Design a protein around this nucleic acid. Structure first.
Lengths: 52, 122, 52, 202
RNA sequence: AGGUUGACCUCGGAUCAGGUAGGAGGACCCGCUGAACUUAAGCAUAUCAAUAAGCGGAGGAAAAGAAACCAACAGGGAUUGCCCUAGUAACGGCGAGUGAAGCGGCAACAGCUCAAAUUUGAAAGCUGGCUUCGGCCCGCGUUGUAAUUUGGAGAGGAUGCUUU
């Protein structure tokens, strides 16, 4: 049980990776290359009104 | 026949319950000989007689114990079977009054300085 | 001094452990017992092992 | 009271009066049984400061124990291993003779609780002690908040576990740098220092 | 009656009235006792190890614990545990090796009881028995049961407000 199961990652690198993934989410070719069906989506990034 | 319900037994007293126990035991004793001499549907009757004897013994014991608890209601020493069981450690545990007894100096301190209810302004 | 207890240790006395209905179980129906009936005026019973 | 005078007199164990009393009492206790009940404490000031009361539920038992060291029960008093440069004549028991006296008295009175004990005499063969015991099942004990802590089951056989005064001394339960290895429990401290601790995010 | 009649002390008896202990379990806990394989070329210091086996004793936790502490500072302030101190100070044949603590951050926090004093204008205390549940008895106990005090103080004074 004392195998190393958990991985310590720098918080700065975690924040870097999260920011890169957020930037990649705004690129419509990357959404299709990841396999999302977004051909009828009116705009990327898609922002819906908070009143809805 | 041979099936005695508990509801009719709960209203009887000791003498008719003893009489019923005697008749049931006699019928079971005869019916065992009937079993070893011939085969029939009387095995159902021997099973019901056994359970009826068990019910009568249960009711007699329960009424006797209830009467004894009434007799020992206001006495300091009870029979060991009538005393509550709990566990051995629970029976050896200090009583609630003895465990809650405090010294008089402690009582004076608690009377004049108990834990107060307070709030602190933010 | 003899004991003069302030409480009985057992509240209810036991019923007799070996009464007649427990002593006599059933008669024996074997051919040896059936011989003994008219040969010796003897009945054969199966009884409790603890009865004298 | 008189107990202050008794304490100051008990300090003077080499005075003529105290040596006379010690000699005659040593003879009497040697004639009595190895473990026997005392009708009252022979040192009332000592018993009172150790916690004895003249109350139903407090008893005193006097016990003598053979003094000196300890012998290992090996055949012919010799071992069959590596050389030790010593004999069993110089082996020292890690508990006190007072603790041995308390344990034997507790076994004689298994229904009671050992509160404390005190030295009363010694000669070349024996050391003599008086042990204070409390009846946890007595109503006068159970109703008293100064003593009914001993009726709780966590204090069963304190003398067997070293929870009496001599037991605390032998376990070395004192504060500070001289007692680094023993103050929280020697074996527990050893286990804490020899435990390998591995966290998730190491 | 005094060769008697008693008071105590100590020591016994009882299938005496009422209770209690034992065995189990033992992962964890408190003690006692205690190896060798191993590692040191071998090997009697050492190491394995204050470990395994053996023995006694608890609980839901145990143990520890309100300083005869740490410190040497502008001082901290019961106990326990985690991180750190630190593989450090230190110990060690022919060297293999061994190895804490104070401070600091945090989890959690909680404080108290006796002995030593004459209530002495009143043993004010308590087990048990019987109760009509009001109490009354047999006793324990002055070789000291209550109240009061525990070092942070306290006792005696003074003083005027608060408290239940």
């Amino acid at each position: 049980i004392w195998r190393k199961w958990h991985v310590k990652i720098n918080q700065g690198q975690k924040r870097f990776a999260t920011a890169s993934a957020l930037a990649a989410s705004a690129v419509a070719p990357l959404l299709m290359a990841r396999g999302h069906q977004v051909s009828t989506v009116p705009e990327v990034p898609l922002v819906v009104d908070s009143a809805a | 026949n041979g099936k005695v319900k508990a509801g009719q037994l709960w209203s009887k007293n000791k003498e008719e319950l003893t009489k019923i126990l005697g008749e049931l035991k006699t019928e079971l004793s005869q019916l065992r000989i009937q079993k070893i001499s011939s085969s029939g549907a009387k095995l159902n009757k021997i099973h019901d007689l056994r359970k009826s004897i068990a019910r009568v013994l249960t009711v007699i014991n329960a009424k006797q114990r209830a009467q004894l608890r009434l007799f020992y209601k206001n006495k300091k020493y009870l029979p060991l079977d009538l005393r509550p069981k709990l566990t051995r450690a629970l029976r050896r545990r200090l009583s609630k009054e003895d465990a809650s007894r405090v010294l008089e100096k402690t009582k004076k301190r608690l009377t004049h300085f108990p834990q107060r209810k307070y709030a602190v302004k933010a | 001094l003899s004991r003069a207890p302030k409480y009985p240790r057992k509240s209810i006395p036991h019923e007799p452990r070996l009464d007649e209905h427990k002593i006599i179980i059933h008669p024996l129906n074997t051919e040896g017992a059936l011989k003994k009936i008219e040969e010796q005026n003897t009945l054969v019973f199966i009884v409790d092992v603890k009865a004298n | 009271g008189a107990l202050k005078y008794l304490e100051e007199l008990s300090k003077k164990k080499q005075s003529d009066v105290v040596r006379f009393l010690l000699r005659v009492r040593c003879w009497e206790y040697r004639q009595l049984n190895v473990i026997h009940r005392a009708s009252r404490p022979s040192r009332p000031d000592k018993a009172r400061r150790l916690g004895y009361k003249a109350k139903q539920g407090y008893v005193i038992y006097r016990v003598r124990v053979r003094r000196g060291g300890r012998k290992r029960p090996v055949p012919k008093g010799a071992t069959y291993g590596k050389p030790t440069n010593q004999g069993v004549n110089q082996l020292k028991y890690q508990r006190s003779l007072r603790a041995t006296a308390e344990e034997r008295v507790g076994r004689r009175c298994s229904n009671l609780r050992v509160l404390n004990s005190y030295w009363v005499n010694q000669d070349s063969t024996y050391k003599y002690y008086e042990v204070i015991l409390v009846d946890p099942n007595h109503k006068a004990i159970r109703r008293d908040p100064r003593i009914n802590w001993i009726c709780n089951p966590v204090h069963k056989h304190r003398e067997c576990r070293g929870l009496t005064s001599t037991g605390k001394k032998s376990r070395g339960l004192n504060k500070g740098h001289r007692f680094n290895k023993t103050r929280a429990g020697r074996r527990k401290t050893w286990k804490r220092h020899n435990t390998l601790s591995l966290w998730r995010y190491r």
